[PDB]
């Protein structure tokens, strides 16, 4: 029990022996962790303050440690007055150490008790004491209170001004005193006075340590108070150009880096001009590197647009990209990359070649250095050329060419990073050239007997670029790849990742071969079934590759065979599900794929039925059977689209790529449905405005681009047949089944969330409840749920507000319908609902939970928890009702 533990811990505090006392004191925060109950926290802190008052100095310091650690819990203190009063009493002790500990205690407590005048006066008094420990404690407490309070801030600002101006203060204490001024951002005039004070400081104390501290404090103050940021940047540039000391210059670099990271837009053209001039003039490599890092950080924002041709920045960037030092070259080429991508001015198009060639030079420099700094510079250069290629395709071709030329002679880690960069290049830009594939295959061959330890990641990355490059099917080169794998790998995990990439890029035959080869290595049950299911899905998709244009019999045959393999695969997959990591997304995705293929099979069957079931002689109702079958097909495809949308809403944890893939599947379903509608059911109602910029969309994957291309082709095909034929013409079914086989021609691509799941978040959804309640007293149910997270909470999404919806029904009707939106508010929400049950009997209470993200999208994620409640009345009400029922 909470109170039992509290007093069992308390008896240690009263033990007298110091060991047990300090043991209990440091045991207290764990008790707060177990029981965040404000009653317990209040009582415990009162006991803490009592023992702090009466105890010796070491016990007081232990209580100080506890107070500092228990920061999150102390805003729930009820009797703050008594607590701080008995804490404050120790400040009158003649023992300077006790006064210092009390000052530190008040500083820790400053969050819950600002604007307390006696505490402020105690801080102000101790600041001018003689004992250095008390003075340092007073400085710390002043920092905290000035962070919290406002009037205290201006008072301490005045006192610090007259103290630093004074001569009694030693140099070290002056150093400790200056960063107090970083909290003077409470109002404009106070900040301006602090700025005048800091100007006085830098003028009249020019030695290294305190100019360092003072101008860093000025930087923080300007960052907090945005009014004086331009003059602060101007002052920093002045100190960078004029001051000769290396340390002061390096601090200026760091402060400008902070300001660039925190407010790039405020920078002016003059500031960038001055920084570029400083970079050009200085001869030291380290200072140049740092200020070019600042410039590069600026270049990756809107500062370039505010800056604007050939100017100081361009000349500096060109000069630095060929500098000997690796870091300077990296930052210079990044500046050139940013300036080229950001704007399309004529001089930029002229100098874009310079950026590319400098990038190649950096690549050849870093291709064999093999050091962590070299790895970082190589990563920077590869990211820069990926961005440049995303901006400049005609440059991207030469980028690909030089990447392939340097791939062969590069080292293993350099090859891994180069392959990652090339994979990004190929994924974003489709027309990479199949001439790449020969070089990659040749490189893959020689690497087969290269090493054993680092060979694994190089192999998987090389296989990834092979699959991404092969937009079409494979050949005997796949046989070479699998032979090399079987001969040299002997690891399996790399085989699994290569098969996973194969399934990702649609090379499903390779995936089938690898999964079949890999089945024996596994040891568990669910993993064995999962691998078998992946093998069967790969086989089913490799069956899909047998389609040819305009052949519909073979198309139906392939669809049926793929349905057989898919059913075997889904049986194996649903055998693999376990309570730990239940394969929910995979099961639902495979079910929807099977249902879509079944819908295509039935639609092909109806297109054949147009000639197989001629219209009755009794008889656009002439082809009655075909009309009814097309109605059923439209219903089935609409339901399939709705279920794909439901899967989309349920897949909140999934990444962007998986969501886009599911959206593409739903769009295919909607395309088939709309084609059915326009061609058969009502071409008059088909007033489509499809004419637009659909083809100009930026597709992020080859599969997505092909899907959009076939969408556009089918849509323009439908429009040409809008009115040109009778509603049940053979051309309609011909175009429809042509669209079906065209959609099925491209291979299905899996995504991250199918294999690897991140951002795992669920809702416990506790509540306050086989249940019954009086009908007169309407039910009030309190619900609350902790929102669990796994590793990074906000990786892709960020839950901005929980949405709760609850329903009531009898015979197990929708009688209690209301929606509530509540924020997590420290990742644990709570609220209540009021429900009524007029009907006596069995009532089911279904409560649903939905998640609203930062973008405003509504996601149906949480548990579909349901509870049963019985409805009944009290005895005397029923008795009087029966008696008066005349």
């Amino acid at each position: 029990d909470a109170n039992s533990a509290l007093m069992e811990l308390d008896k240690g505090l009263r033990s007298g022996k110091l060991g047990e006392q300090c043991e209990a004191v440091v045991r207290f925060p764990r008790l707060f962790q177990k029981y965040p109950f404000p009653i317990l926290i209040n009582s415990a802190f009162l006991k803490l303050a009592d023992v702090f008052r009466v105890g010796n100095n070491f016990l007081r310091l232990c209580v100080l440690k506890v107070t500092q650690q228990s920061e999150k819990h102390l805003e729930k203190i009820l009797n703050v007055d008594e607590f701080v009063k008995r804490i404050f009493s120790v400040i009158h002790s003649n023992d300077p150490v006790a006064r210092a500990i009390t000052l530190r205690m008040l500083g820790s407590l400053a969050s819950i008790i600002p604007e307390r005048k006696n505490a402020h006066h105690s801080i102000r008094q101790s600041l001018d004491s003689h004992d250095n420990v008390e003075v340092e404690a007073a400085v710390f407490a002043a920092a905290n209170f000035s962070a919290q309070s406002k009037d205290f801030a201006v008072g301490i600002c005045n006192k610090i001004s007259e103290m630093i101006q004074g001569l009694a203060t030693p140099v070290d204490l002056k150093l400790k005193l200056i960063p107090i001024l970083q909290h003077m951002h409470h109002d404009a005039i106070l900040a301006s006075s602090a700025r005048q004070l800091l100007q006085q400081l830098v003028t009249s104390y020019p030695s290294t340590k305190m100019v360092i501290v003072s101008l860093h404090t000025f930087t923080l103050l300007a960052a907090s108070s945005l009014v004086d940021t331009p003059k602060q940047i101007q002052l920093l540039l002045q100190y960078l150009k004029n001051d000769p000391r290396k340390a002061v210059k390096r601090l200026a670099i760091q402060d400008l880096k902070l300001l660039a990271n925190k407010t790039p837009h405020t920078w002016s053209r003059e500031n960038i001009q001055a920084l570029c001039e400083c970079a050009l003039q200085t001869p030291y490599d380290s200072l140049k590197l740092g200020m070019l890092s600042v410039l590069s950080t600026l270049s990756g924002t809107i500062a370039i647009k505010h800056y604007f041709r050939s100017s100081d920045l361009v000349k500096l960037a060109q000069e630095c990209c060929y500098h000997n030092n690796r870091g300077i070259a990296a930052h210079g080429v990044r500046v050139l990359t940013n300036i080229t991508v950001s704007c399309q001015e004529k001089d930029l198009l002229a100098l874009e070649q310079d950026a590319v060639f400098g990038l190649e030079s950096l690549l050849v420099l870093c291709s064999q250095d093999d050091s962590p700094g070299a790895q970082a510079t190589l990563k920077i250069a590869l990211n820069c050329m990926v961005k440049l290629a995303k901006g400049r395709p005609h440059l991207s071709q030469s980028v690909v060419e030089t990447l392939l030329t340097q791939l062969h002679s590069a080292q293993d880690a350099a090859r891994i990073l180069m392959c990652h960069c090339l994979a990004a290049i190929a994924m974003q830009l489709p027309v990479l050239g199949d001439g790449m594939l020969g070089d990659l295959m040749e490189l893959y061959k020689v690497i087969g007997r290269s090493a054993t330890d680092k060979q694994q990641e190089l192999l998987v990355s090389l296989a990834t670029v092979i699959f991404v490059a092969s937009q079409k099917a494979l050949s005997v080169e796949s046989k070479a790849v699998i032979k090399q794998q079987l001969e040299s790998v002997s690891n399996g995990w790399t085989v699994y990742r290569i098969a996973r990439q194969a399934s990702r890029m649609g090379n499903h035959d390779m995936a089938k071969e690898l999964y079949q080869s890999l089945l024996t290595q596994v040891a568990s049950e669910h993993f064995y079934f999962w691998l078998n299911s992946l093998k069967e899905f790969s086989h089913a998709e490799q069956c899909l590759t047998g389609l040819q244009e305009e052949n519909y019999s073979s198309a139906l045959s392939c669809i049926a065979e793929s349905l057989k393999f898919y059913h075997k695969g889904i049986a194996s997959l649903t055998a693999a599900s376990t309570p730990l990591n239940p394969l929910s997304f995979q099961c639902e995705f495979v079910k929807l794929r099977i249902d879509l293929l079944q819908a295509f099979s039935q639609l092909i069957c109806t297109c054949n039925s147009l000639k197989t079931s001629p219209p009755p002689a009794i008889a656009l109702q002439r082809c009655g059977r075909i009309s009814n079958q097309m109605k059923q097909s439209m219903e089935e495809f609409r339901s399939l689209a709705s279920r794909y949308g439901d899967l989309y809403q349920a897949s909140f944890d999934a990444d962007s790529a998986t969501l886009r893939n599911v959206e593409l599947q739903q769009q295919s379903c909607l395309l088939i449905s709309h084609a059915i509608e326009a061609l058969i059911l009502d071409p008059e109602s088909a007033s489509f405005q499809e004419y637009g910029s659909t083809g100009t969309a930026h597709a992020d994957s080859e599969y997505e681009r092909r899907m959009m291309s076939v969408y556009n082709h089918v849509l323009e095909e439908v429009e040409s047949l809008n009115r040109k034929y009778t509603p049940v013409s053979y051309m309609h079914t011909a175009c429809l089944c042509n669209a079906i086989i065209a959609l099925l021609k491209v291979p299905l691509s899996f995504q991250r969330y199918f294999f690897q799941k991140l951002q795992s978040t669920s809702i416990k959804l506790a509540l306050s409840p086989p249940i019954a309640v009086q009908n007169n007293q309407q039910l009030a149910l309190k619900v609350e749920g902790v929102v669990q997270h796994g590793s990074k909470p906000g990786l892709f999404r960020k839950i901005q507000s929980v949405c709760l919806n609850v329903s009531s029904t009898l015979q197990s009707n929708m009688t209690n319908e209301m929606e509530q939106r509540v924020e997590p508010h420290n990742d644990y929400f709570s609220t209540q609902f009021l429900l009524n049950f007029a009907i006596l009997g069995t009532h089911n209470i279904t409560v649903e939970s939905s998640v609203k993200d930062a973008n405003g999208i509504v996601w149906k994620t949480g548990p579909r928890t349901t509870i049963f409640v019985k409805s009944l009345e009290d005895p005397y009400s029923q008795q009087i009702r029966l008696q008066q029922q005349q």
Partner: peptide, 27 residues
Amino acid sequence: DVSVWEENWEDDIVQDDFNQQLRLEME
């Protein structure tokens, strides 16, 4: 810090329980 490829699957700083057991199973 920056990453060369954003959609790279080989990033294994965060390994889920399924992949944790799967790696340990056959290595």
